[PDB]
Amino acid sequence: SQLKLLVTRGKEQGYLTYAEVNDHLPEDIVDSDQIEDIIQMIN
């Protein structure tokens, strides 16, 4: 998956900003609630 590279990216940099999270999301994730829950997962 692509979010794997996002998690390793955040671990490389030591952080993760809303820009990169909005980029690396599953494209057809239309659900803002699962959006919030997946960022709450990565955090």
Partner 1 sequence: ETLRVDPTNDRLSALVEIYRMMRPGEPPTREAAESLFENLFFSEDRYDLS
Partner 2 sequence: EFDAIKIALASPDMIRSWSFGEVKKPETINYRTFKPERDGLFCARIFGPVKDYECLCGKYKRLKHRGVICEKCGVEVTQTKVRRERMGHIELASPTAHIWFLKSLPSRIGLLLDMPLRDIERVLYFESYVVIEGGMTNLERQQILTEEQYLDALEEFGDEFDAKMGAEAIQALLKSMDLEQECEQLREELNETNSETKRKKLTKRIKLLEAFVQSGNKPEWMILTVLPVLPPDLRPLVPLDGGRFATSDLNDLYRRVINRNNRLKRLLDLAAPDIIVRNEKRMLQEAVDALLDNGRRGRAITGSNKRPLKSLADMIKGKQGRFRQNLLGKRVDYSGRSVITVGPYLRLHQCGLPKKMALELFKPFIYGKLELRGLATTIKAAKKMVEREEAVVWDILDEVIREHPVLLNRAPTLHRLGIQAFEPVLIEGKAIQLHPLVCAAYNADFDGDQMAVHVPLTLEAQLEARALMMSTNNILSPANGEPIIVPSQDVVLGLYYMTRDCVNAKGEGMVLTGPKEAERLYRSGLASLHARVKVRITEYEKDANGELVAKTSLKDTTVGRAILWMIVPKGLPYSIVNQALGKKAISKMLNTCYRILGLKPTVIFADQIMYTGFAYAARSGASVGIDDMVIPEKKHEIISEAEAEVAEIQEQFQSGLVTAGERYNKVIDIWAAANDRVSKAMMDNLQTETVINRDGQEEKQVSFNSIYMMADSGARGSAAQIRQLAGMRGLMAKPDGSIIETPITANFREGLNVLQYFISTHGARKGLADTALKTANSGYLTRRLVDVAQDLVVTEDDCGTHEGIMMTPVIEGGDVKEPLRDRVLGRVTAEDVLKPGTADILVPRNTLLHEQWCDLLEENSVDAVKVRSVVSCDTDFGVCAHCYGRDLARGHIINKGEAIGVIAAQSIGEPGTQLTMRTFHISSIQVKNKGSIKLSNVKSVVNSSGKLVITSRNTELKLIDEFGRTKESYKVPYGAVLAKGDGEQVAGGETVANWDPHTMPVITEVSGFVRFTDMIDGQTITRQTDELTGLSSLVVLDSAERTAGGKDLRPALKIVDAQGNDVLIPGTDMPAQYFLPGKAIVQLEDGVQISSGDTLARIPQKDITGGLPRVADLFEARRPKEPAILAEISGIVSFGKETKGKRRLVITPVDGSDPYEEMIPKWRQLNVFEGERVERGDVISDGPEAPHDILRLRGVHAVTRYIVNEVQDVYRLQGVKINDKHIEVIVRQMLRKATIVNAGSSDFLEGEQVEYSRVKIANRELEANGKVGATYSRDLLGITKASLATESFISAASFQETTRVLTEAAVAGKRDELRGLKENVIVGRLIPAGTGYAYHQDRMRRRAA
Instruction: Label residue 12 exposed, middle or buried (CB < 10 Å: 0-12, 13-18, 19+).
Output: exposed
28 vs 33 by CB, closer to partner 2: 33
Binding to partner 1 in span 3-42, by CB under 8 A? 27-30
Q: How far is the CB of 28 from partner 1 (least distance, A)?
A: 5
Within the chain, residue ranges assigned H as helices are: 3-13, 18-23, 32-42
37 near partner 2 (CB under 8 A): yes
The residue ranges that bind partner 1 (CB under 8 A) are 27-30
